Write a protein that binds this ligand. Structure first.
Ligand SMILES: Cc1cnc(C)n2nc(CCc3nc(N4CCC[C@@H]4C(F)(F)F)nn3C)nc12
Ligand SMILES: [Mg+2]
Ligand SMILES: [Zn+2]
Length: 313
């Protein structure tokens, strides 16, 4: 256990910042993740051989799709790392263990299609899981990989601690269904404003961890503008392929997914920042003040989309 992972200087410094981009070198992403586990959890948290085997099977179970791919998994895990490292004393040891794994696993075996497309196509997954269809699938894939021989990274926990970590992971992964975010955020907003928010209340922590999951999942809007803008291309590449598959079933896609409305993307981003992203980081910053850099970066990117609309960029 004298075997620390170490990053080149620029990465060692910049990985601590919320806006870090993990880079185009896929083969460095596993080491970046182990580095983050070792600092946010400890060199004691997992056996290195088991953790390495788990990461590589997780990678193999992400698909070659434009956005919901292995790079997205590691990107979402890094945003969680930055949240955890900026709120040293707010989280339990089980939470530090579970949440980086949940982030790495949270889109396992994504096919690049929405819950709504699986329901309209009548995919078998839509009959097995009637709500949060893909997110129940991602959690089921995580359990599968944890059960492969030599892949049980939680083997040193008691039965009850193992049950607890798998429940943190399950709830964190379900919470990445954006349909559930609007309601979660409204309850958190009321709880904060009436001062009823209690981090010793388990159902309150669960809500706060859900919002952390949304914030990490949406973190492309918190990056430097060139990263944000190029990530948006990948996001729409998926939506528009789904739009094409909606038109093949004889269904007009929603505007978000209709490549004929390419021109409105700037205005679509404004709506998304104002309805989803800004509210997300605003409520997160109220509950967890040291996450403010996420809100500040989001607002800078909103202002860049505003520039695009005025043709100033
Ligand atoms: C989940 C998520 C994560 N991260 C990001 C950055 N995004 N961007 C989105 C798309 C947002 C969105 N774009 C549109 N547009 C685009 C043109 C037509 C339509 C409108 F007519 F509005 F302009 N509608 N909507 C709702 N969804 C996400
Ligand atoms: Mg997802
Ligand atoms: Zn995701």
């Amino acid at each position: 256990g004298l075997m620390q992972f170490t990053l080149p200087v620029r990465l060692c410094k910049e990985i601590e910042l919320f806006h870090f981009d993990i880079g185009p070198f896929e083969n460095m992403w596993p080491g970046i993740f182990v580095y983050m586990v070792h600092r946010s959890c400890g060199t004691s948290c997992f056996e290195l051989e088991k953790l390495c085997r788990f990461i590589m099977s997780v990678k193999k179970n992400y698909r070659r799709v434009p956005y919901h791919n292995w790079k997205h998994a590691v990107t979402v895990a890094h945003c969680m790392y930055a949240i955890l490292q900026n709120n040293h004393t707010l989280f339990t040891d089980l939470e530090r263990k579970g949440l980086l794994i949940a982030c790495l696993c949270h889109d396992l075996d994504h096919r690049g299609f929405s819950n709504s497309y699986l329901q309209k196509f009548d995919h078998p997954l839509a009959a097995l899981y009637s709500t949060s269809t893909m997110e129940q699938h991602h959690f089921s894939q995580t359990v599968s990989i944890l059960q492969l021989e030599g892949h049980n990274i939680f083997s040193t926990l008691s039965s009850s601690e193992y049950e607890q970590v798998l429940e943190i992971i399950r709830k964190a992964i379900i919470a990445t269904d954006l349909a559930l975010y609007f309601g979660n955020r409204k309850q958190l907003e009321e709880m904060y404003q009436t001062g009823s928010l209690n981090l010793n209340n388990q159902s309150h922590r669960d809500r706060v961890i859900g919002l952390m999951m949304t914030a990490c999942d949406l973190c492309s809007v918190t990056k430097l503008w060139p990263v944000t803008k190029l990530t948006a291309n990948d996001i729409y590449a998926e939506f528009w392929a789904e739009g094409d598959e909606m038109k093949k079933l004889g269904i007009q896609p929603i505007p978000m997914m209709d490549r004929d409305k390419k021109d409105e993307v700037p205005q679509g981003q404004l709506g998304f920042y104002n309805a989803v992203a800004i509210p997300c980081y605003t409520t997160l910053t109220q509950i967890l003040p040291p996450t403010e850099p996420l809100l500040k970066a989001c607002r800078d990117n909103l202002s860049q989309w505003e520039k695009v609309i005025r043709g100033e960029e």
